Design a protein around this ligand. Structure first.
Ligand code: NA
Ligand code: NA
Ligand code: NA
Ligand SMILES: [Zn+2]
Length: 866
C-alpha cells in the first residue's frame, strides 16, 4: 500500500461540474449509470484518471461515442485523448449485499444505504473521488416498490414515477455543488417522524427522521435536538439551514458514528434512538452532541469543504469545537469542559505518545480512514479553542464570517481558515500555525518566585515537545497559558506590571521565558492553564494545600475539578509504586478530608461535585506513567475507591439519599443531581458488602429510568457484589432483543474485574444478542475488552493479545475499518514492560503475515513494529 503526502497536492487535471446518476437498485446486483459533464484544466495530453474499486465496468462513452482509448489499472479507469469539454457516461455494476466493509453502497438489515466519506464513492462508480472536485448532483433511483417504498438522496424530489413489474422511481436534485463524499442514497421501508423548523428569516424547513418500523417511540429526542441545533447555530454563529428538507436516517450497521451528507444525514441508530427505559442521561447528551455535530457540518464541512483529506481537521476540529460550544451553552459548561479535558489527557495524549502520532493536519497517510482520530477531532478542536482564547468571541465570529465570505462554495485548507482568523482580528497567528504541523504533546514546566521586598511574583515557564516517531524535529509553539493568582482570602489578585494591567492569557512562545507581575500584595496561590487553555502537560511543584485551597476557592468550576485531579495524581503515582512492591494503599488523612469537604459543601454545584467524586479512569491514570502497569493501575483504582468508601461512608449515604428524585427528567439540573447520586452509589458499592448489595439491588429494581438502573448494574459488576449474576441475567432476559440496550451489558461483561472475564467474553461471541456483522456489537464486546479493560487485555499470560489476534484475523477480511479501530490497544506496546512488549510484538507479527492484509491494518502494524 503506498503512502500519499500532503506536499504532493496538485490541482486536478480535470473537473466535473455536474453528474446525473441513475441507480437500478437491487441488493445482489445494482446497475449505476453516471453521466458527468467534465472540463479539462490541465495539459492537452493529460488523461482523465478516475478512481474505482470493486466495480464491474459495462461501458464507457464520451459524448455518446463508445470510447476505445481507455484502460483499467489497479484502482482506476484511465481515459485518453479527450476533448477540452465533454460528457462522460459510465455504466457499471456493484453488489451491495457483498459489501461487508460498509463503505460505498451496502445493506443495513433490509435497507440499502451509503457511506462515502472518505473515499467510498469510488466503490459506487468511477469518479474523481477527491474533495476539491465539486459537482451538482441529480440522482434517479429505481427499485422494487414493496421492498423499497422510500428512495432518498440529497436535496429535493424533482420527479417520480411508477414502472411495470412492481418498480417505482424517484429523482432528487441538490442545487449546491458538492464533493462526492457528501453523496448519500437510502432505500427501504421506515417509520417517519415529521416536523418543521422555521428559520429566523422565515424559511420553513421540513424535518424528517426515518427509523426502522416500530421505533417511532424512540425518535422525539433526536428531533428535538435537531431543532435545538438549528436554533443554536442561528443564535451563536448566525448560520441558517440552506435547503428545504432536512432528512436523517437511523441505520443499525454503520462504521462512522453519523455522517453529514447534505440534506440526508445517515446516523448509526446509537446516536438517534432514545427513551427513558432504554437510554441513559449520557446517551441523551451524546444524541444531542452528534445530531448537533452533523448539523453544524452543514456550514463547516459542506458549504465550505476540504481541498484534500490532509485538511480533514479544517471541518472536524471546527465542527467538534462547535458541538462542544452547543452542548456547553445548552447544558453545564463546566461538566462539558471537564469531560473534554478527560478525553484529551486520557485518550488523545496516549495517541500523541504512540506510533500513530500525527499533527492535526497530517503530512503522510496510507489509508485515510485511519485518520479520523482523537488528534484530528479532539486535539483539532483544542486548536480552534486556542484561536478563540487568543481572539475572544467577537473577533472569532468576525473570523468565521470572513472565512465563509471568502470560501463559501469552495474546498479550502486549514491555512485558509487560520488566514481568515488572522485577517479579521489583526491577531498574528504566524507562529500559531505550527500547531497544525507539529505532532506530540508539549510539556510546559512552571517555576515561581514571590519577592516580598518588591511585591513581585515571577513565573518562569519553559516548554518542550519530545520527539515522536513521525518527527524528529520539534520547535516551540505559541501556547496561550491562562493564569489566575489568589490571595489568602481566595480573591483574585489583579495582574499588572509597570502600572498597566496584563492580560491573564500569557503568550508562552519561547523555549523559556519569564513573566513578572507587580503589586502582588500577598504571596499567591496560582491557578495555572485555566480552563485547560492549551493541550499540554503541566509540570508545577504543587503542595497539597495549594491544591485543596483551589478546590475551595478557585472561581471557575473547571479549576476546582482540575486541582482535585492534580491532588489525586500524586497519590495514584504513590500507590501504583506501592502496589508493585506488594504494599497496600496509603493516603493522607487531609486528602480524604478534601473529598469529604466536597460532599458536604452545600454551595458547590452538584454537577461539579459529581465530577470531583468521579475518579480518573484507568486510561486517564495510564497517562501519568512512562511505562504503564495496567494491573497496578486497576487495583489501585479499586483500592482508592474502597478507601474513600470507608472513610466517607456516612457522608456518601447522606448525599446519596439527599439527591433522590422521584420524577425522571432530561433536564440539566436533574442530570447533575443524578450524576452526583450515582457517583456516591459507586463508592457505596465498594463499602460494607451487605449494605452495598442491598442499596445496589434496590436501585436496579426500583429505577424508573435506565441511567439509575445501569449505574446500579455497573456497580454490582465493578464491586463483584452478591446480586451481580441475578441482575445481569434479569437484564439479558428483559432486553436481549434490543441491541443498543445490550451494548451496555456487553460493555459491563467486557470490563468486569472478575478473574474469568476473558472466558466470559469468548463465550459471549455466541450470545443471542451478539454478531460479528455489527460494528456496535463488536465495539461493545471486543473493543471494550481490549481498550477499556487493559488489566485483562494485558494479562501476563498474553491471552488477551491472542484473543484480539483471533478477532482481527476475522475483521481484517470482513470490515477493515472496525479492525483498525480494534488494533489500537496492541500498537501501544512500547508503553509496556519488556515481557508484555515481546508478546504484543509477536501478535503484531502474526497479523502482519495475514493473507490479504488490509491497508488499514498494514499502516498501523508497520508503524508499531518500527
Ligand atoms: Na451552559
Ligand atoms: Na471511514
Ligand atoms: Na517557587
Ligand atoms: Zn465531523
Amino acid at each position: 500500500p503506498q503512502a500519499k503526502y500532503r506536499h504532493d497536492y496538485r490541482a486536478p487535471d480535470y473537473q466535473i461540474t455536474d453528474i446525473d446518476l441513475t441507480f437500478d437498485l437491487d441488493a445482489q446486483k445494482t446497475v449505476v449509470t453516471a453521466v458527468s459533464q467534465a472540463v479539462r484544466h490541465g495539459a492537452s495530453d493529460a488523461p482523465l484518471r478516475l478512481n474505482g474499486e470493486d466495480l464491474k465496468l459495462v461501458s464507457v462513452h464520451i459524448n455518446d461515442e463508445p470510447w476505445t482509448a481507455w484502460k483499467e489499472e489497479e484502482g482506476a479507469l484511465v481515459i485518453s485523448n479527450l476533448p477540452e469539454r465533454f460528457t462522460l457516461k459510465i455504466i457499471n455494476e456493484i453488489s451491495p449485499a457483498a459489501n461487508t466493509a460498509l463503505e460505498g453502497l451496502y445493506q443495513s438489515g433490509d435497507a440499502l444505504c451509503t457511506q462515502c466519506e472518505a473515499e467510498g464513492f469510488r466503490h459506487i462508480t468511477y469518479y474523481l473521488d477527491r474533495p476539491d472536485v465539486l459537482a451538482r448532483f441529480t440522482t434517479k433511483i429505481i427499485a422494487d416498490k414493496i421492498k423499497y417504498p422510500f428512495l432518498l438522496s440529497n436535496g429535493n424530489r424533482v420527479a417520480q414515477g411508477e414502472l411495470e413489474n412492481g418498480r417505482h422511481w424517484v429523482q432528487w436534485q441538490d442545487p449546491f455543488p458538492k464533493p462526492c463524499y457528501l453523496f448519500a442514497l437510502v432505500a427501504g421501508d421506515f417509520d417517519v417522524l415529521r416536523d418543521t423548523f422555521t428559520t429566523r428569516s422565515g424559511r420553513e424547513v421540513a424535518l424528517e427522521l426515518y427509523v426502522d418500523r416500530g421505533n417511532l417511540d424512540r425518535a422525539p429526542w433526536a428531533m428535538t435536538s435537531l431543532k435545538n441545533s438549528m436554533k443554536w447555530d442561528e443564535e451563536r454563529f448566525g448560520l441558517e439551514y440552506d435547503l428545504d428538507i432536512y432528512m436523517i436516517v437511523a441505520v443499525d450497521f454503520f462504521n462512522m458514528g453519523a455522517m453529514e451528507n447534505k440534506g440526508l444525514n445517515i446516523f448509526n441508530s446509537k446516536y438517534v434512538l432514545a427513551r427513558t427505559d432504554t437510554a441513559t442521561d449520557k446517551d441523551y447528551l451524546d444524541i444531542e452532541r452528534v445530531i448537533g455535530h452533523e448539523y453544524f457540518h452543514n456550514w463547516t464541512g459542506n458549504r465550505v469543504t476540504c481541498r484534500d483529506w490532509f485538511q480533514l481537521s479544517l471541518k472536524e476540529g471546527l465542527t467538534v469545537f462547535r458541538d462542544q460550544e452547543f452542548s456547553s451553552d445548552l447544558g453545564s459548561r463546566a461538566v462539558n469542559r471537564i469531560n473534554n479535558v478527560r478525553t484529551m489527557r486520557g485518550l488523545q495524549f496516549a495517541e500523541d505518545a504512540s506510533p500513530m502520532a500525527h499533527p492535526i493536519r497530517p503530512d503522510m497517510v496510507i489509508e485515510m480512514n485511519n485518520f479520523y482520530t482523537l488528534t484530528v477531532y479532539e486535539k483539532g478542536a483544542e486548536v480552534i479553542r486556542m484561536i478563540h482564547t487568543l481572539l475572544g468571541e467577537e473577533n472569532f465570529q468576525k473570523g468565521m464570517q470572513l472565512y465563509f465570505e471568502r470560501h463559501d462554495g469552495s474546498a479550502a485548507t486549514c491555512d485558509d481558515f487560520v488566514q481568515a482568523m488572522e485577517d479579521a482580528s489583526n491577531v498574528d497567528l504566524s507562529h500559531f500555525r505550527r500547531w497544525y504541523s507539529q505532532s506530540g504533546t508539549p510539556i510546559v514546566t512552571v517555576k515561581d518566585d514571590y519577592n516580598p521586598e518588591t511585591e513581585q511574583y515571577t513565573l518562569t515557564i519553559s516548554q518542550r515537545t519530545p520527539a515522536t516517531p513521525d518527527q524528529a524535529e520539534k520547535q516551540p509553539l505559541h501556547i496561550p497559558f491562562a493564569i489566575e493568582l489568589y490571595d489568602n482570602e481566595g480573591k483574585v489578585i489583579p495582574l499588572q506590571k509597570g502600572g498597566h494591567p496584563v492580560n491573564s492569557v500569557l503568550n508562552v512562545t519561547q523555549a523559556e521565558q519569564t513573566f513578572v507581575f507587580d503589586n502582588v500584595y500577598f504571596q499567591p496561590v496560582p491557578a495555572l492553564l485555566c480552563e485547560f487553555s492549551a493541550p499540554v502537560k503541566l509540570e508545577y511543584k504543587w503542595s497539597d494545600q495549594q491544591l485543596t485551597f483551589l478546590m475551595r476557592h478557585a472561581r471557575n468550576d473547571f479549576s476546582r475539578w482540575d486541582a482535585a485531579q492534580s491532588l489525586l495524581a500524586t497519590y495514584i503515582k504513590l500507590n501504583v509504586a506501592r502496589h508493585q512492591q506488594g504494599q497496600p494503599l496509603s493516603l493522607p488523612v487531609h486528602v480524604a478530608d478534601a473529598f469529604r469537604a466536597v460532599l458536604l459543601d452545600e454551595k458547590i454545584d452538584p454537577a461539579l461535585a459529581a465530577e470531583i467524586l468521579t475518579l480518573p479512569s484507568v486510561n486517564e491514570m495510564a497517562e501519568l506513567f512512562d511505562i504503564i502497569d495496567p494491573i497496578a493501575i486497576a487495583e489501585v483504582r479499586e483500592a482508592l475507591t474502597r478507601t474513600l468508601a470507608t472513610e466517607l461512608a456516612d457522608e456518601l449515604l447522606a448525599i446519596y439519599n439527599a439527591n433522590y428524585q422521584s420524577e425522571y427528567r432530561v433536564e440539566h439540573e436533574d442530570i447533575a443531581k443524578r450524576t452526583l447520586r450515582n457517583a456516591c452509589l459507586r463508592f457505596l458499592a465498594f463499602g460494607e458488602t451487605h449494605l452495598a448489595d442491598v442499596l445496589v439491588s434496590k436501585q436496579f429494581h426500583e429505577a424508573n429510568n435506565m441511567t439509575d438502573a445501569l449505574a446500579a448494574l455497573s456497580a454490582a459488576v465493578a464491586a463483584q457484589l452478591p446480586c451481580r449474576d441475578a441482575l445481569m441475567q434479569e437484564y439479558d432476559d428483559k432486553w436481549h432483543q434490543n441491541g443498543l440496550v445490550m451494548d451496555k451489558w456487553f460493555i459491563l461483561q467486557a470490563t468486569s474485574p472478575a478473574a474469568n472475564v476473558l472466558e466470559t467474553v469468548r463465550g459471549l461471541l455466541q450470545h443471542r444478542s451478539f454478531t460479528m456483522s455489527n460494528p456496535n456489537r463488536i465495539r461493545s464486546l471486543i473493543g471494550a475488552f481490549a481498550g477499556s479493560n487493559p488489566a485483562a487485555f494485558h494479562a501476563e499470560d498474553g491471552s488477551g493479545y491472542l484473543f484480539l489476534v483471533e478477532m482481527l484475523t476475522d475483521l481484517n477480511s470482513r470490515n477493515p475499518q472496525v479492525a483498525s479501530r480494534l488494533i489500537e490497544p496492541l500498537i501501544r506496546l512500547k508503553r509496556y514492560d519488556a515481557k508484555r512488549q515481546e508478546k504484543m510484538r509477536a501478535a503484531l507479527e502474526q497479523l502482519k503475515g495475514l493473507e490479504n492484509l488490509s491497508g488499514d491494518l498494514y499502516e498501523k502494524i508497520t508503524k508499531a513494529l518500527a
